[PDB]
Amino acid sequence: DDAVAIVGAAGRFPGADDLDTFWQQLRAGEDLIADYPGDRFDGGPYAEVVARADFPKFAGRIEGVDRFDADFFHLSRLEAELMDPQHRLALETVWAALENGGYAPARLPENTGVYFGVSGSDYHHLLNASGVAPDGFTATGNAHSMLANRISYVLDVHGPSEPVDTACSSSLVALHRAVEHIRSGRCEMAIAGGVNLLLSVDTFAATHMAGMLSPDGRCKTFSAGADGYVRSEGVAAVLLKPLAQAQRDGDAIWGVVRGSAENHGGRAGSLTAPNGKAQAALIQDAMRGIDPDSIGYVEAHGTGTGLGDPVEVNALDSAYRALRTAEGGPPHAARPCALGSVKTNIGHAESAAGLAGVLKVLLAMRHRELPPALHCDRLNPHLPLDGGFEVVRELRRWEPCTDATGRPWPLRAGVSSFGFGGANAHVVLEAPPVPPAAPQAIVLSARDDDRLRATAGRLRDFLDRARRDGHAPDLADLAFTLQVGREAMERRLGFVVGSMDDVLGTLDRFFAGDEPSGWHTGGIRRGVRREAEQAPEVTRALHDGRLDRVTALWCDGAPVDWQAMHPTGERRAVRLPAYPFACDRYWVPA
Amino acid sequence: DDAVAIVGAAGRFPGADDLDTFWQQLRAGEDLIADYPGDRFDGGPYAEVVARADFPKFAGRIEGVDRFDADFFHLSRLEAELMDPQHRLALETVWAALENGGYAPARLPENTGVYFGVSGSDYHHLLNASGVAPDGFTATGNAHSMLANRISYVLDVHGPSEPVDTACSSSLVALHRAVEHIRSGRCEMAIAGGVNLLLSVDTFAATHMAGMLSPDGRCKTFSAGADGYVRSEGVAAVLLKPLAQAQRDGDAIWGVVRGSAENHGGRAGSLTAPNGKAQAALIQDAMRGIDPDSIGYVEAHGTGTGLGDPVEVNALDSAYRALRTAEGGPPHAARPCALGSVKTNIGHAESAAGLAGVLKVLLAMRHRELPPALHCDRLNPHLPLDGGFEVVRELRRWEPCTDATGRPWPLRAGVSSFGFGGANAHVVLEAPPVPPAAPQAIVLSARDDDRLRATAGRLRDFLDRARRDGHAPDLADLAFTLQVGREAMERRLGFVVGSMDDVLGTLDRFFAGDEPSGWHTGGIRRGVRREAEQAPEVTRALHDGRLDRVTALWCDGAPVDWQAMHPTGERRAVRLPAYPFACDRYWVPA
Ligand SMILES: [Cl-]
Ligand SMILES: [Cl-]
What we know:
2 copies of one chain form a homodimer. By secondary structure, chain A is α/β, with parallel strands linked by helices. Chain A has 20 helices and 20 strands. In chain A, the strands form 5 sheets. Chain A has an 11-stranded mixed sheet, with helices on both faces. In chain A, strands 17-18-19 form a 3-stranded antiparallel sheet, sandwiched between helices. A two-stranded antiparallel sheet of chain A has the order 2-3. In chain A, β10, α12 (about 310-325) and β11 (about 335-340) form a beta-alpha-beta unit. At the A-B interface, α5, α6, α7, β6 and α8 of A face α5, α6, α7, β6 and α8 of B. The structure holds chloride ion (CL) (2 copies). Chains A, B: This is AT-less polyketide synthase. Chains A, B: It is found in: Cytoplasm.
C-alpha cells in the first residue's frame, strides 16, 4: 500500500568515479566525451584492430576499467583475468551502493532480489581475438547470468537474481522489475543496477554501418544538428526498499518511485525505429494516478538522433495532454515542464543509460537544481511549438510545482529509456520525505592493514569537510552506521569517543602511524550469519558500560549484536565514503 | 482469481521436429544423443577447430539448424546469414505454438508479453572465428534482446519483451515471469519460450575443464554411475492465458499452472554447487496451497551429476515432508510419488531444458502415461531409503492421486530447473479441465503456391489419420480454426463443404494439381490490423448465405470478419499442423 524508496546509490561514469563528482560535472556543463580507445589495448595487438575499423573514434570512458580488487572477493588472478570487467565493476559498485545506503550484507533480508542490466559480451570477443584458449573461468566469467548470480552469491541473498537485456533500456527495466517484486512482496529489499563497457570493435563498427553514430561523437540531444549518438561506459546500482518500512528504519532516502511502466513498440515501421504512440501509451501507464501538473522535469531518453528526439518529445506532449484531459483539467499546461538529458554530458551509456538518468534526477533533487543541456544552442525545428516543455540550457534553481489552491507538491520527475529493439520503460520519481526532528563505539575494518589506513584516512577527510561546511553527521548515527552498515572484515580498528573531534583526532593519529593511545587494533582471516549472536563476555561488558573493552574484543573477533544496543526506533543511517578497493590490474592473459 | 492455462505449444528437440514425435520417443525409451559436431561445420575450417578441442564429443542435436524461412519474415539472405540460428528457430517455433493454440497474430491481445530464455552467443563467436567482418546485421542478429524484441515486432504486440538468462533454468523462469504478469493483469496473454543451440567450441571446452561433462556423453540421472552431463540443443514455446478466460473462449488447453516460484541459492559453498536448503525453500514456496499428496510426478532437474541428483531428491523429500506436516498430515507419504527426467532421453538442453521438462509432462498428461528413465538400472546410493519417491524405469499408466474420502484430483506434477549459477525455478502443473459436451467455409493460405500445396497436403494427411483413428475434428471447429487461427497470407485457397469427405476430397484434388472444380484460388503480396473490418460486398454476401462467394472474395483480398459469423460462445479451437516453413540454408558467409 505504498511506494518504493531508493535507499542507497552508487555510480561510475565518464570522468566521475562517484556520484558526488558526477553531480559536480553535470552542474558545470562539463562534456566528458573523450577518444576511443586510449591506452586500453596498448599492451597487445588489438590496439590497431581498432585503428583499422570505420566508426567515429569517440566514447565516454570510465578510467581504470582494468582495475579490480580480486582479493576482496577472493579470486585467482586467473579467474579475475578471464572475468568480464563488466562483472568486476558491477560487484564493486553494488558494494558501494550497499555501503552508501548503510547496509552490510548481513543487514539485508534473505529474500533480496538482484536485477542488473547488461548487454554486451565485448570482453569475451576480446579474449578470443587475443588467442586466449578457453578455461572453466571464461564461461563463468562471461555469462550474463553470472553477473547477477555472483552478486547474490557474494551477498548470500535468495530473491530472484536476473540479468536484464532490453538493450538501451536495460537498467531502467531493472529498476522496474525490482519495484514490481517489492510491491508484490516477493522481495523485502532489492538491488537494481546496470553496466556497460566498451571493450571491443564489433558493436562500434556495426552501429556505424547502421548510421547511428554521430561524426563528431556527441549526443547533441534536442539540437537542430542532431545526427547520431556516441557510445559511453557507465556502471550504477541502487538499493530499494518499501517507503514505509524505510521511514521506520530511518534509512537515508534518495527518492521515491511513484510510478513505473514498461512495454514494447510492436510493429513500428522498422525493427529499430521509434514508435511515438507506444512511447505515449507507456508514459500514461506509468503516470497512472499521478497528476501531470505535478511533474517538474523529464529526463528524456534523448539519444540525439535526428528522428528520435522530436518523436519522444511529441509523444511526451501527447501523453501529458491525454492525461490532463482525463481529469477535466484545461487543455494546455499551467506552466512549461523542464526537459533534459544527461547523454549530452556523458554520451549514451546504453545498458547503464537508464540509471544514469535516474541518478542525475535524484542528484538534482538533493541540490534542488537543474543542470544545463549541451550542444543545444539551436533547438530542433520539430519540437512542439505549443510551449508544453522547455529544454534547460541554463543552470537553474529547481522550484517545486504547485496546486490550484497553492499547495506545493514534492519535486517530481519522469525518466524515459528506450531500447533500440523497441523495449521501453519509464519511471516517475518523487523527492524524499522530510525526515522528522552518550559515549559511542567507533568501529572500522578492511582486508589489509594498508586498506585500513586507507579507510581511516578517507573517513577523516570526509568528516571534516563536513564540518568546515557544517554538514556533520550526528555522532551516534555515524557510529551506528559504521557498526551495522559495514561488513566486519579481517583487519579491525576500534575506539570510543564522546565527541567528534575525539573522533577526528583519533583518526589523524592512526593514519599518521602513531602507536596506539586509546585505540585498539585487531585481525583475523578466512557464509553470511544474519543471526544475532553475541559473545558471553561482550554481553556483560556492555552490562557494565565498558565500551572500550567491547571494542577491543570485537577487534580480535568477538561477535557483537550492535542493533541490540540502540533504541530500535531512534537511529538514522548516514552516507559515508565507501571501501577503497585496491587498484590491481586484471586484463587479457598472455 | 484463477490460474494460467497453457493454450498452445511447440518444440524441436534432439531427434524430434514436433511435439508428437518427441512424445513418441520418450514413450519408447529412445536415447537421442548423437555425435558432435557432424556435418554442421564441414563447409569451412572451423570443423577441426572442434576436433582439436578436449571435451567428450557428444550432444543432443537438432537436425536442420542452418535452415530457416527468411522470406516468411521478409529478410535479406545477408540479414539472415548473420542472424543467430537461435533467433531463427525461436521465430519459427513461436509461430508454430501460436498456430497450435489456434492464434493468428491478429487474434492476440495487443498487450501480449514475450519472455524467452536464451544463454549463449555461440554463433557470434563462430562468425568472428570465420573472419566475418562486422555488419549492422550482426549486432541485431546476435543481441539477446533481439531474440525477444524481434518476436514482439513480428507479432505487433506491446507487452513486456524480454530475453531471460538464468543459465540452465532460463526457460522455466520465463514461464514463471509470464505467469506473474498474467496473474497481475499486465498481460492478457503471453509467450514463454527457450532456445539453446551448440554452435561453438568455447562452452564445450570450458564445461569440460569444470569437470561437468560425462565421458560417455549421457545424462545418467539417478544412476549410481552418474558422472556428468551432456549438452543438448532444443527450442520450445508455450502460449499462456488466464484459465477462466481460456475456458469461455474454448481454447484447447494443454495444462494449468497451479503454482510457480523462483529464488536464488545465495552462498552455497561454491558458485556452482547445488544448495539443497534453497531448493527446498523454493518448492515449498511454489507448492503453497497445493496438497503434496496431490502430486503424482516430478520432472526433476536431473543433470546426472554425481552430486546434484541426490541433493535435489533429498531436498524434494525434505520439502514435501515439511509440507505434509504443516497441515496435520501423517509424517510419511500415503504412496510413493513418481520421479523422472527427460535429460536421460535428450540430454541437458540448458536454456531450453526447463520447457522440455514442462512439455514432457503435458504430453504425459495427454496420454495418461509415464515414460521410462534411462541408464538407470542401478540406482544412486544416496537417494532416500524412506520410499517417498520412485524413479519410473518402466513405461506405466499414469493413474490419478486420490484423497482420503476417495476423491480423485486431476493429474498434477512438479517441474524443477536449476541454473548453474544458483538461480532456481519450480513449476506445479495440473491437467486440463474436461471440456463440456451447417455449411462451413474452408480457408487456407501460404506465401508461395508451393507452400500452399504443402499446407493443403499436410492437412489432408493429418485429417484422415484422425479418422482412421476416429479423432476427427468437428467440422465447424476445424473451419473456425483455419479462419481465425491462421494469418491470412499472400497466396490463398478457399472452398465450401457440408461434410468432411467433402473436405478431404477437395484437398486431394488440389494437391494432385487438378484445375479447380468447386474450389477457388487467389493472391496478393506486400502492421497487424486487430480491428474488425469487413468489405461491403462480403457483408451482404453473408446476408444471402452465399458462402462460396465470400470464400472467392477473400481469395483476391476481401477483408472478412470471421468471428462475427459464429456464435461467440460456441466454437472451440483445434490442433492442426503448423506452417511448412521452407528449408533454405543460411550459414556463415564467405
Ligand atoms: Cl559484528
Ligand atoms: Cl481475414
